[PDB]
Design a protein around this ligand. Structure first.
Ligand SMILES: *C[C@H]1[C@H](O)[C@@H](CO)O[C@]1(O)CO
Ligand SMILES: *C[C@H]1[C@H](O)[C@@H](CO)O[C@]1(O)CO
Ligand SMILES: *C[C@H]1[C@H](O)[C@@H](CO)O[C@]1(O)CO
Ligand SMILES: *C[C@H]1[C@H](O)[C@@H](CO)O[C@]1(O)CO
Ligand SMILES: [Mn+2]
Ligand SMILES: [Mn+2]
Ligand SMILES: [Mn+2]
Ligand SMILES: [Mn+2]
Ligand SMILES: [Mn+2]
Ligand SMILES: [Mn+2]
Ligand SMILES: [Mn+2]
Ligand SMILES: [Mn+2]
Lengths: 387, 387, 387, 387
């Protein structure tokens, strides 16, 4: 009873994940930097399908065109040697001190133009390597104090930046879509578009909404105490789940980025149940950081645990939905009735229906138990294999 | 140096606020029920402009048409005697046991039809009394466990309900708009459309989006650790701030509903600064609960404190924006540059601009300080009157 | 592969748990009151070992001595008929309006004396029924505002009350110990002795500290985002884990009191691992509330799930500690070295030891990986039965 | 109406505060390192009374005895030139990779011995410079996973380390006391002794408890959603408030370390009211980080704001306690009765007192309002100078 990933499971990792040196707000790096080529080769051996990157993880900031070409050729050769793909790319608009007040919403206009130029250079590179999704995480867009940022002007600048990138893509004829990833705080006191709902609502005001979706991250909605599977069902309902970042988080605290399955394990089960039952077919990407307590062996063990946890959860959710006893419980709790229209008969019919009001027996309907606890224990038994 | 409210300040209160008997999850009522007529008269004496109500606060659940008419006539006479208005009305779809699994998203279809009928009866009453906004708080829509609610089917049922109410309003020719009020949890484990962003995104999928906005509540976004003034700027940016619920909350915990100004006092200052500078002209509604430790004198003192706090905050934010030294600091922090387009020159111009990339001096731009702390201390001095 | 509780597992429940009518801050009761006799009989059939009670769950507030005796005789007969025990009793000092500002720390002295008298009457009853532990939850001790309670005077009054109860017990020669249960908020804005550490520190200032321990509750430390198993290890380290309240909670929000195993499932696993490995031999008490969505069948199903979850977790933690591969991993992560004294050789020896400083090779020690992720995945595999 | 600090206000700052280069989990330093000599001179000009330091802020890790002596002589000359004192010193047991699993509770015994040796070397230096308090923050003591740390063995190692340091101090005849500073998480997933209560309870198990107190930090208890002024009243009640760390934090999130007065402004008011009314006479130390958005001018402006905010709050709390109208309100809310013994008459007298039970009129006592809202609005008016 083994759970081995294969490239067909679509498991992906950022170069910055297994590549995290372990520098935190209070401590120095505990591990030496890894060459991207080595990470590609080690991930291919564990069964991953591909890798993702921020421009600066691949090309050291400030590289001359000559060095650039060389970093790209070497990476390209490792992808050719392993059959690894690059489904998503993104921009680092947060490390360099120039981005201290943001990229697209920095108060200085010069910095905003530079941010857009640095992003466009990376879209051309992503297209060349075959990425289908381009993620945007505005980690420096926000503030630590109320007067420092007028939010309405900041959203106009954010809209302007995204509309210009959609103009660029369409003008070049590229087949690439954008995914905004929300985060409520850290490193800024408060970050703009803090949750999946704030990002979905913002998208609706862009000039070409169809080019943009969301890249929700497990730990980020949990940093606001929200239910991750409910936010994902809302992104699926809107047709905007373009990509997803998988990891673990223990509650409302700093962003831990623990391996997938760590953190809220029951939320992990319900998320896998939803992705698999809705038919999500994008990459299963891990945005995690192997703890700084680990050496290189612990890095690979942590990345391997990410994929394993997904596969065990997949099996338990499939056994849960497939159990006749669970199907019976779902009917007992009226999940079948939630799926039926409340009033397909129309407004006039509902208004004339005496059984909906005048003769509705409220006490009899109130007395019906929902049987949710029996259903939840069945889900618990299946997650634990005590079924 | 007094701060006296007048009906022109547009201060409103729910009947259920000063009318809260003090029953909590762990204790019995500490105060006798108040007749709505008495609350109207006491609020008019404190300087309020109007009151709001849930159907059941005005007409005891189960009232016969005869008793209904009588409760309405008496209320109407107290409004005529005091000049109080009723700008907003809403439905109680949470107290009666029948709503234990929700109103519009209850799993039982019969309950969903009943919820819609109970709501429509109250819209006719609200229109008759002159309300311009009809609020919807789905406090029972959500779940305590993952299998109990399929969220995509729940959003289809929620969409269906709102579309049917927009069909009803348009069919009757009423001038009334809807405002959804988000709340992340309590009484359900997790509530659907948990934050202002989730409610704004949902609105965009209704058949007539222009009929719906949001009614954000101070304490509810704070229950998710979010910045209330930033969520309000986002609702203003979208043109959807139809109404607002003012109160106080001390962090991530149960919903306290403390008087406005209690809780996060600096967030209260920045919210008043934003409402007044954006020109919000709807009601300033208080959705609060005088603590159960109080008698009737403490109830009126708490409601009076709500209005006073708003007025003191209004004065301090106006003195802050009006100070030449602050205007100078805003320019020093580049708030003026955040308001200018990043690239009014267009994409091609930005692409050809060498000053935006090829010749941009990153180290010089990085070295510029933002001067936000000096600006924040000025705001602090003005809030405390130490200016 | 079944997990059937027997009275030998020491599973206990409060009358107020399966007896919860479902009244919440926003809604009416969804279930009829249960007679304590019926609850005793139903719990005995599920395999529970005993029940616990607050004075008011057994004797309706205000009962005459005549009615009192009658409620006691009937209860006593149901305990005799089923073989159920009563290991713990406690006082309701939170429901009646008189306790609106507290019991032992109410500002009115008359209320504080009444609280003590009501408590002493219940200690005599608990002793008569055989309880060995008397719990104290000061749910109304605290405040919603800063000026309402001087905390140093409130701790003097709290100390005074506990010292008087220890004087009473010793004077009567009773074999009963006290357990304080902490809670950080709800129903008060902030509650005194908010966490297990605040309660342990307070105990050390009582006149007879040996008579008092703690009754930590899973969901209460989680309402402050703390690690429940770490707080329990600290109460065990101090020799003060007198009793424990088991339940589930999904993060920092209102107190959910979900069935044990719901909420943070990995914290439940590590707590069971600790109770069983430390040899805790007190009752495994469930302080939970079957959701108001349920009827009586759902109440019994929820209580049965509490015991089942404990038993499955017990098996998985025992299989985890018993696996040779895990024992090897524990040695690889140096758990054996954490158990050895850092300097049994003494201060002078450590000061003269050049290998501890002058010749310590920091880079070599820094480079050693801790291998915690491999260990954590082993724990994950065992919890999920994928081992 | 100015508020100028003088050395007599006892304001202190860590070298690491104004010296923070701005490196965060997601970005590079935005400011050049400051020489400690420059910080001493700039702080003396703003009116500070002294500075504090971690060993590594003063002596670069790895310095030879020769360089050590030189860093000390230069610092000593700047203290002599400005009249600045050094009231507290502490150890960096968190930055170097060797401390990745802790200092005193690292699983490797060699690292624990090294941690103790590095600490003892710094106590001798602190004594030489005149510090009276030696702080201990175990930021790396804790874990990200359940199996990595047995907490009971970790507390035995923590006790062992503190007992050895108390043996060292007593053996050398030094007049120095220890203060443990709690923090609930960050950088570890969960940190041991997470709150002021966990640290106070732990102290009671050391061999010489009188040598140890607490150094609570505003933002750290707020990271657990707790009330900082209530935790401080508890440390004062126990006689253990040896030192204090002042700053601001906006809720449950990463540790912001904002300037004092930022964050929860009403908690800042109640804390100043308590320190001043209890007569705390230790240093008013700021443990803050000027935001990375700032240049050197913004660093000094932020440190100056820390002291200003304290002084404005001091004035408003003194005006609040001094107002006859407030004294009257305090009596109306029975604060005077909370300060009187509940039963100075003794247990027997209380037991025989019929007015405490048999004839106590519960309904009359329940009906008395506490008048807390009127009192809280008075406090609000005084904080805002609207009084
Ligand atoms: C480095 C980033 C990217 O912006 C995003 C890619 O999904 O994930 C992060 O790690 C930020 O969360
Ligand atoms: C009773 C409700 C209404 O639905 C809303 C009116 O603004 O406010 C509440 O009190 C729910 O928050
Ligand atoms: C009713 C109470 C008791 O004080 C305690 C018994 O363990 O548990 C509660 O339910 C309060 O948490
Ligand atoms: C650098 C530390 C010290 O341990 C403590 C001194 O009060 O404060 C910090 O900044 C850790 O919070
Ligand atoms: Mn993250
Ligand atoms: Mn991510
Ligand atoms: Mn509310
Ligand atoms: Mn509201
Ligand atoms: Mn509880
Ligand atoms: Mn309990
Ligand atoms: Mn801090
Ligand atoms: Mn500190």
């Amino acid at each position: 009873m083994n759970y081995q990933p294969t490239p067909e499971d679509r498991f992906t990792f950022g170069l910055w994940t297994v590549g995290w040196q372990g520098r935190d707000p209070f401590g120095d790096a505990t591990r030496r930097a890894l060459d991207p080529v080595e990470s590609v080769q080690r991930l291919a051996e564990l069964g991953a399908h591909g890798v993702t990157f921020h421009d600066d993880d691949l090309i050291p900031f400030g590289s001359s065109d000559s060095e650039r070409e060389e970093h790209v050729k070497r990476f390209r050769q490792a992808l050719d040697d392993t059959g690894m793909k690059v489904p998503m790319a993104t921009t680092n608009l947060f490390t360099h001190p120039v981005f201290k007040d943001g990229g697209f919403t920095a108060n200085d206009r010069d910095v905003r133009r530079y941010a857009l130029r640095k992003t466009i250079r990376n879209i051309d590179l992503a297209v060349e390597l075959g990425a289908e999704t381009y993620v945007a995480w505005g980690g420096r867009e926000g503030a630590e104090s109320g007067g420092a940022k007028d939010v309405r002007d900041a959203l106009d600048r954010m809209k302007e930046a995204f509309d210009l990138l959609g103009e660029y893509v369409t003008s070049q004829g590229y087949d690439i879509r954008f995914a905004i990833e929300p985060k409520p705080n850290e490193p800024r006191g408060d970050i703009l578009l803090p949750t999946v709902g704030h990002a979905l609502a913002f998208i609706e005001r862009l000039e070409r909404p169809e080019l943009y979706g969301v890249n929700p991250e497990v730990g980020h909605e949990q940093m606001a105490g929200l239910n991750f599977p409910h936010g994902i069902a809302q992104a699926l309902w809107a047709g905007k789940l373009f990509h997803i970042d998988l990891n673990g988080q223990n509650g409302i605290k700093y962003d831990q980025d623990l391996r997938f399955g760590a953190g809220d394990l029951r939320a992990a089960f319900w998320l896998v149940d939803l992705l698999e039952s809705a038919g999500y077919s994008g990459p299963r990407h891990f945005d995690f950081k192997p703890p700084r307590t680990e050496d290189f062996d612990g890095v690979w063990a942590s990345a391997a645990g990410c994929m394993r946890n997904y596969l065990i959860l997949k099996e338990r959710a499939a056994a849960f939905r497939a159990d006749p006893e669970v199907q019976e419980a779902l009917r007992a709790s009226r999940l079948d009735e939630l799926a039926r229209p409340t009033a397909a008969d129309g407004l006039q019919a509902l208004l004339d229906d005496r059984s909906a009001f005048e003769e509705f027996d409220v006490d009899a309907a109130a007395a019906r138990g929902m049987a949710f606890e029996r259903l939840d224990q069945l889900a618990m038994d299946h997650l634990l294999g005590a079924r």
